[PDB]
């Protein structure tokens, strides 16, 4: 249509522009006239006619002459043929392709410049009423204005383009340049394009048009054209207004972090349909039981196959296969309508918190097994197996409308708490919870390496693999192999001028602080500075979009292909006018645009909706509360810790929660820039939660964390338990009364003093742990002063006090063989007290020591509900589970036969009862459970009678009948014994006895006559059944004082006599009970044999029970008369009345036969002694002591007892009397005259029994406990003599006083004698093995290594038993079971080592060659565990490796002083004669025992041996002067072995003499006792 004006050139200008003949026709004829006026108003018609001036002169001269014309006879095409090409003498560009674009550019400049006249005329019509944006941008250019929209100013800038083209083509007159008219065509299409996309919206589409008219300047300047100099200012104002200042790097950071997204309009409408189904699947997943996890795991896989099929652009079977998943959920919903027992979501926090330790791209299979039995939605799971996911995936789980549960032990403190409180639940949750705690064991085993790794040095790693990727794309080259100055030089060459400021102010401090991070504060500050860093490099001020740049370069290609095809078809009609039918030269001259030049137009499709509304929303939020002035106030507040810290942050995490939820459901079409921004707001919220977990570690009133028990490495350290008591001192003292939780912690420290086998380091936490138990009783008395129980009623503070003294008895035992299996179940109870009551504790990471104990607690519970007592008290899960199934099968048959019937009463009544039976919790006794199975049998029996024969429930009545019979047999077993519970209820009075003895014994230790009178009331005012429990507790205070040692030895003497004196009456009290029980055991055994069934008749069984319960209450009531009878009657009655063995200590020639050469080998022995004359005279004098024999007194007293038996028993007492009265006065006159002959302040000592029981010496040594077998026989009848006691009685009572005073003062030197006797016996055996010593004395170098062996003696065989248990729990859930053989073989070879280190009492030098073999075995044991810590689990072997690595001249004078004091001590003994029953032998034989014990002076001789052995075991000697010391100790050994044999003769003679006179005292006193009564 400009060629139609070019072909219509008739000379001159189609008759000289006739006068508007096209107007005489009258749109195509009127618009063509405007192009001709535009052709003549410029000089374009006048510049062409100056080109034909050589052509007109050449045609005039060559051809015939004629009249001259103004314009030549040539068309305006000017480029065909026919010497018009030879008019290219000047301006040689007609052969060039710029010839056709001269006439064609004025067509397009006209059509665009006149289009701006129409819009500018429209601006003066209206104002702000259904106008366009380009029309409203002319409001600042014209009069009529508006209210807004002056930011882009397109009309004032898309008008200076066309006036330069109006100013250049008007005054050029050149038609010759380097492709000028080629370059005036591509600009004049962009101006058409900048007018179409500026009508309504899209400020973001004007980012391409500041580059298309900027690459055009760089193209016209590369052609060396002089036209670029002429204007040079067509976009230097357009970039002044539209430029951006905040984030320049959005166009470069978008490309590498982008994931795949669908590309068609048909896909996002179907992608929303899949998430619409993915929400309905979540509501069905939380309603299925444990058997339907084979079908949910299939339906959570098909969503992955459809997430790969939406992206595949393959929609053929999509709508078909998506209906199959609707058919799959509807089948899964149909089962969900039939569940009568709704699923209680239990362990909801256990499976939710095992995801956070696993949720990443790696280990994507462990998450899928944790997926369906949890609370994680399926729309978040499909971003794990497929790697469509962005930024590290922990951030998508933490915040819900949980960062403390990933860096603490809060997972493990809650598994223990939900396991102890499991048994207090209803009866519907026992078949669902044994399959819920079983799946939790199969999860913590398979996630064991994920729990144990470091969690504060792991997120440091995932920052440096994500901070060194941002520097990788900005700075060219790798950020690892580059210096600190080499990276700063490449910022100015690769990046802009504004990003250089923030890249050296926020990111480079976020790399320095990420390397020097040692706490959670230096890593939480290095994460937030990175968080504010990439918000100044991604978010723009004005709307910039890196995806519009590809969708305009295709729309511009679509328009310049349209104008090229418009130019071809409008020119094709001109071919039939002044041309032939083959070719025109301008057909070659025009450029044809190619079809195969598509500039890759789909990346991510964005439709005509404007994105300029989104970037208004981001800068309305990021400048509101996420600015750099809003975030630096919180960092400057946490560092100062002034005030109001944790309440600004919750306002911050709530603003960004609704913000990222606005963008998720917002705009529905593109998530490229939403996902990358979401990884920068989730990151900066994680940077503050790293400062919550630092200030909570800074507040610490108690440095003892929970889970202080349930770890075998913190209990076994003897120093650590002592340091865990001085820190809880603000918890025991600052407590309130009636709390009943402080007194359950002090129970646990008494089971650690037992567990360490009563060490001397833990004695402070055993004495001071009992004093606060008494102080919580001394206050509760200050405020107080200011069918078993059902038939007993017809006619918690005492369960703690009862257990504050059962542990106090069980500590003081012989041996325990301590283990870790039963000492951690008592630790699982204290942590539920310590984590609920005690606050402000320490936060720590999970360790391998505490995971080995919680797996033991879950498998201890789930093996108690499966594997298989006292009737009407027990709970019996394995019995309630059999009843829970046999009733549920009846409940199923009711609902089958209810829907046609419903209105009956029997089918309604038992349906209510059967629902009530399954609702009973498992803490109920079997009495209430037998009642509800009795009522449901009677309703089932009467419905079988009235109904027809089509019922067929014979199979259910027979099973209920045999179960009720099976529960009556367990009732008969409680009637059989029935006294073990009665003996325990009288044992429960221990808890108030312990505090009564602690006030009189220990506080007096903290006098002698005050204790016995306070203890005589403890045994006298007592019962008969609770008498053995008193003797079993005073012994627990007798071993409490021997545990203290020799600090108060008197208070252990006041308590040993009173135990043995009241142990004397125990066979009388035990006889009174065991014969009275024979009358009551037969009566109960008769009534049990009556209650037996034949032809069962279950209704008759209940009536036979109540008759049996009435008779059994009286027998228990009669049995309480034997127990609660008084015990004062037996004590005041005395004993009835036939004489004992001894230890018989005799060992002489064991060490008498290296002594012959020892005399010759011995340097000062000649300074101040033979051995042949000494050791022979020492043995010659030993015979004279052993030949001396004392007569017995029990033979004299037994002579009178046989004479008084004949004189008394032969009397027939019929009123022979005068002959008998003389004979009666003979033996009364002979006995009191015989005892006057043989020997014989006394009354100030012997007032009563409680006076001589105080100031008396004990016989605690275990050689002569038989010597007190008769002196406590003469203490029962000592008050009975004073009650009855006419001149012989006053003489006989005064005669037994002087013999008692000569029997009390023997006990004190004789008990001191056996105190030194057992010391010299234990030191004789030290110097005996010291003669057979073959090496050297290494006791300064080997004594420290024995303690290292003995510390491995008591613990290391016990940890091997504990590590052999947790490998059996893993063996039930894994295949790693062959690792048990490398611990039992490691245990059996240790038994060959600890016997060798215990077989020697004094140590040799050969053990240094044997201790190095033990040290080599540990380094070989430590390698066998490391090679076995593979293809399995590591937390079992981790604590045994961690514990092992955490635990890996003058002597001749001392043997001369004990040799001069052993002869002078023995010389004074023979200074008194031996002299073998003549006269006065009771005042001499009780004197001779006091002389021979005194003259041995065993307190001095056994003292010099104590100083002599101290110079041989403390210090050490080399291989020199060691054969000389061994020649001295073997020189004075055959003297000590004779002095020890001089003590086995004096002791064995004065022990038999003491058991004979005390037996003679007992026979004589019963004669005087019967004389005063008869």
Residue numbers in the entry: 2356 to 2381, 2390 to 2764, 2772 to 3156, 3174 to 3182, 3202 to 3274, 3280 to 3417, 3427 to 3557, 3559 to 3560, ...
Paper text:
The AAA+ (ATPases Associated with various cellular Activities) family member Rea1 (or Midasin) consists of nearly 5000 amino acids and generates force to mechanically remove assembly factors. Rea1 consists of an N-terminal α-helical domain (NTD), a ring of six AAA+ domains, and the C-terminal tail. The Rea1 tail is subdivided into an α-helical linker region, a D/E-rich region, and a MIDAS (Metal-Ion-Dependent Adhesion Site) domain which is responsible for the interaction with the Ytm1 and Rsa4 substrates. Rea1 pulls out the Ytm1 complex to promote the transfer of pre-60S particles from the nucleolus to the nucleoplasm.
The Rea1 linker map revealed side-chains throughout. In addition to the stem and middle domain, the Rea1 linker also comprises three α-helical bundles at its top (top1-top3). The linker emerges at an angle of roughly 120° from the AAA+ ring. The 210 Å length of the complete linker fits well with the ~200 Å AAA+ ring extension that bends towards the pre-60S particle when Rea1 is bound to it, suggesting that the linker is a key element for Rea1 tail remodelling. Comparing 2D projections of our Rea1 structure to this data suggests the pivot point area is located in the region between middle and stem domains of the linker. The horseshoe-like arrangement of the three linker top domains is stabilised by the middle domain. The various interactions of top1 hold this domain in a strained conformation as indicated by a long, bent α-helix. The connection between the top1 and the top2 domains is established via an extended ~40 aa peptide region between them, which could provide flexibility during linker remodelling. The top3 domain is a four α-helix bundle insertion into the linker top2 domain, and it connects this domain back to the globular extension of the linker middle domain. The D/E-rich region and the MIDAS domain that follows are not resolved.
